[model samples]
Target: NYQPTPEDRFTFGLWTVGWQGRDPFGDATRRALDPVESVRRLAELGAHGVTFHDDDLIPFGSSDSEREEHVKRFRQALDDTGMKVPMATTNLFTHPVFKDGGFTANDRDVRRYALRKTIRNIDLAVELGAETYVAWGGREGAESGGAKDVRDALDRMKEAFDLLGEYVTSQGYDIRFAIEPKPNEPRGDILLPTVGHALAFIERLERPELYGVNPEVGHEQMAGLNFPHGIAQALWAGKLFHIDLNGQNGIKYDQDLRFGAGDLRAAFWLVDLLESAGYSGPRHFDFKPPRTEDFDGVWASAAGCMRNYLILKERAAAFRADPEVQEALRASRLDELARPTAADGLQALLDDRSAFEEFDVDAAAARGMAFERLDQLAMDHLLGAR
Candidate 1:
């Protein structure tokens, strides 16, 4: 059965299922969903957990009493359903004060305020037992080169993360920060716009180990990059702290389509990669239900996300187990890739005359990699033709 379960480790964001069909060209087509209701409904659908931005759980400028009430009810729902809160984030992009940006804004006061807001949410996240805090930086970019000093902005961004890293360590919270990247949309361009860029930026941080990437499917597709390939590199670097699963049709605005709804082939490989790599993080869905959907449709979409993932996981396993597929992998020389090209070192290789002198270049080039057959086998498994 494709029905999800808590053991599946699947999670959804409150804002994702709570999106009220509001878009730039239209107003909300549905009513606001209470955070408590979201938690209950998601648990009913067999989700293991729910995550949120601070504003998703409590409105900005909420009175202290109002905030306490909201949290109490939400926590009660979680307890009732045994749903976990695995991750949390701050809403630095929604407020007018962050129109310029949050951590990299030109206004020093606004930057300070942004950091304060994030710090407050970090405390709440830890209190709720969240292990990963994500920083999206959705508005952390400039519309024009004339408006921003790129080098200076990166300096400010690094400083913000350094301070937050220090805060988390001082409090002894078991948490790591994940930087989510998007090429552009909310801003003309965003800092650390890809997994590679974010990985590089993390290296420059004061506590690089405390930071990693939360790569979204549509965000990378929006830049015309392969989503699974980006994820592979992230895993290789040991910085895939979190992931945001969804779909995208092509290079365009972020669609956030349901998983498997767009690029079905890519989705298959992504699940395979995650499963094969033993990525032990929340399988979080960051997609928004389309504007056309009502409440029922929203829940259906949410369930579909987990169902699709589980289905792919099964097929990927079957593909890997197929004896012919293993033989095809051998033909493709995939196993040889694991061996070092220079296992004996440079001097040893130079001393070996047969290493290069007698190597048959034409014969190697004449042989086909037989990749087409291997690829077709994958397609057969993916399509249930096997």
Candidate 2:
């Protein structure tokens, strides 16, 4: 007997177990053991990998020796679970010591401490068997422009990454750094506001072999720049090293819905783009589901992710079929993808009021909307929810 891989057979990961990694404002105690349970929970849900942060596993402000012991145990935990570290990130932003972000803080001493921690964690990444890591500047900006000097702050950040890169290279550990991008949350103006901006910053470092991007869908959607399109662009650059695949869309703030809720159609389109770009990596969920339900939220959120992958598999097949869509591909030479469609046009034809109207093309032309368009029929075939 041979095993067959589904077209959309992709791996899953989680930044933290239940909530968005380590929220500074949340129960800090609960987040402390995020490392311990993260892998266990991922395994329960059949997730492939788990992301760790310095704050999640190691208690903040622990003595140097205590920090070493806790971190050692955390790495050992990964081994115990038989899970892999697809990627990880520094947790400097959450600890109160970092009122601003780790590397990009206004305080010189804090910036230096952040650099020290990143270097320490890069060594830990080697110990934990992680290949990729990320740095999201969650608290690296100000409410007003003057409070945060964006330019010099970036220099501080670059200094951190440069030192981090040099240490990893010298140690012969091939650790890839993925700078995560977000619009706003803890800070009103975060650095690297978009995926494209992150790419530009990576280029500034001039270390192609060392760094890439970890795009989160919720944050991307918050920026109002087509979340999946960002994913597509990242894959095209061979820069999509990590993914935080949760949902939050529309004008309101991020709600982190179960996989395909807010904009499932857009997600389908994104998934197909990922297929096109040949991105084969873990799709982690860095999210916050409804506070009303506890375990139910976890079950629904995780299951929703799994369900989306199945639907995405079906979508991939459908995308490859459809002769007219394929023809549209080869002939149109257009930079576009047809969103997934179905064949339930029967009611659309009947419900369409224009069909009932008498034809008076020449004598008394009836000026009407949503009527007499030849393309509407084709759309019925393409878009009718069969």
Candidate 3:
């Protein structure tokens, strides 16, 4: 009863298992494993789907024929293993030519090439039956804010996504795009640096309905944010198109540690929110193994991420079903707080100065509601105290 069922539908990035463990300061850490074997291994270890960048499965400089062959073989592996690809994305930042960024690059030729690459990958995603396509514009920022007109750069990004959405509409494909935000890494200050910023930017798009955000746990935590809270906001707006689950600590570089390897409290709430929402998409891990771990350790960490998520998910289910917590929710008016009266003329009342003058905010705050108990109950559940 305690172990995760196959229905849990865990997913992993193909690159994570195939990662040669290379970093800027060090050489390759482990022997390179083929991406096909990664798919086979993930299916054996409980992961139902696998995510990938175009280059993760296809060689970077491969010709059209070469890419076709590679994708054909990879599709065969996926078919044989009964694995799925819920999400697929283009890698537009890693190559040296993208030094000026992909979609926002000042060089016209570079921008054109970037769009061509991304469009090709969208076709691949369709071939793989991926539901979502993510655009993490890793290099889409300037070192010095003065180096480029920030407004123009942002507009460029919007243009690129709008074009992508138009293509989807013209082709009549039931696909969507997601913008994954990061504070920095390859760039000094990436545009759309947080989920909130991405949300705001998405509003300015012409075809916003065809696009949403793919919030990564490490990326959000790197900006010293509550990752759960950010995702909650995304869900609130019905814009949580995809997600990249990983682990990171406060205001640091992206550790990309296995999920639950950092901040269990944060992870607990995230799982709670997802389970409560009855989220049906892939629980994808964008994490990596440590540079020092051997082949066995890699698989263990991979499995550990899914296991920890399941344990937290189970605990979250218990917390929600607990009689004491339900009583607390009722007594505290927690559910009632989210409900608002559906009055047709509420806006007219809001516009009236007398309404504002008569509103008693202090009285509302002074009400004898024991809100702290709700927090304590959650904390207690998290700590196994209840």
Candidate 4:
């Protein structure tokens, strides 16, 4: 059976199931979901853990006692159900104070306030057993060309991250920060808008080793980039500290559709890569149930996300294990990529006559890579035709 278990390492965001079906043009069509209930219900559905933004569990401006009470209740629920908190993020976009932005906001006061808020949540996250903290700057960008200086904004962003990195180190917290990237939305263009951009920015950080990426599937697809390729790059760079699994339809507003809902083929390859690459992090779902769904539908959608992933995981394993597929891989000379183009030294290659002067260009050109057959095998396995 395709039932899930804690061994699967699956997780869900509190905001995902708790979304009240509200959108840009609509109001809530469902009731607010309690954090305790979310924990209990997700556990019942075989989820190993749950994550949340600070505001998702504790309201933006709650009293100290109120915050304490909420945390106590949530902790009790986790204790009761054995659900883990592997990751936590801060809500920097929802509040009006962050309308301009958070870390990179023009107002110096707001920037300082944003840093303080994040620091506070970091403490809560550590207390709740979260090992990864996600930073999604949903509003950190300018709408007009002249409205903000990109250079200055990046400098401020670096400063905030450096300070946070130092804070975590000083506190002896066992946590790493993962920056979530999105090309646009909520703002005209978010800084560090893609996995490549975020990797480059991390290099400029004071403690680059302390930071990594949490690539959301829909975010990259919205920008019309290949999600699996981006993930492969992230894994290659050893920066895939976390991930957000969801779906999107082409280049449009973020659909936050369930996993495998849009671009199912891409989802197949994504699961394949993750499984093969040995990515050992929470398989987290960061999607929203559609507004049309009632409460029962909300739970059903959540179940579907896990089920689809399990199915793809099984299919991808089969694809890799197939003898014909292995032969196709060999025919395509895919393993040739593992061998270095300059295996010996540059001088040796330069001196070797067969390297250039005696190379068989015509013979190599005549042979086909046979990628078509290999791809069809993958397609067949994905559709269960195999």
Give residue 56's lDDT in candidate 1 (0 to 100). 91
Candidate 1: tens digits of C-alpha lDDT, residues 130-220:
9999999999897888888989999999999999999999999999999999999899999889999999999999989999999999999
User: Candidate 3: where is the Cα deviation over 4 Å?
Assistant: 341-369
lDDT of 3 by residue, 1-386 (tens): 33544578788888887777888789998998888888888888878888889988898999889988988888899989889888999999888999989999988789889999999989889878999999999989989867778888888888888889888899888889999999999788898999999999999999788889999999988888899899999999999988888888777778889999888889999999998987788888999898889999999899899888987887788888999989988888888888864354878777776556877888887876777887788888877786
| Per-residue alpha-carbon lDDT of candidate 4 for residues 1-386, written as tens digits (9 for 90 to 100) | 78999999999999999999888999999999999998999999999999999999999899999999999999999999999999999999998999999999999999999999999999999999999999999999989988789999999999999999999999999999999999999898888899999999999999899999999999999889999999999998999999999989999999999998999999999999999998899999999999999989999999999999999999999999999999999999999978889879999999999978999999989999899999999999999999
Q: Please give the CA lDDT of all the candidate structures.
A: 0.94, 0.68, 0.87, 0.95
Against the hidden true structure, what lDDT does model 2 obtain?
0.68
Q: State every prediction's TM-score relative to the real structure.
A: 0.99, 0.78, 0.93, 0.99
Write the candidate numbers in order of decreasing TM-score.
4, 1, 3, 2
Tell me how candidate 3 scores on lDDT: 0.87
Candidate achieving the largest lDDT: 4
The CA-based lDDT of model 1 is what?
A: 0.94
Which portions of model 4 miss their true places by more than 4 Å?
Answer: none
The RMSD (Cα, Å) of candidate 3 is: 2.5
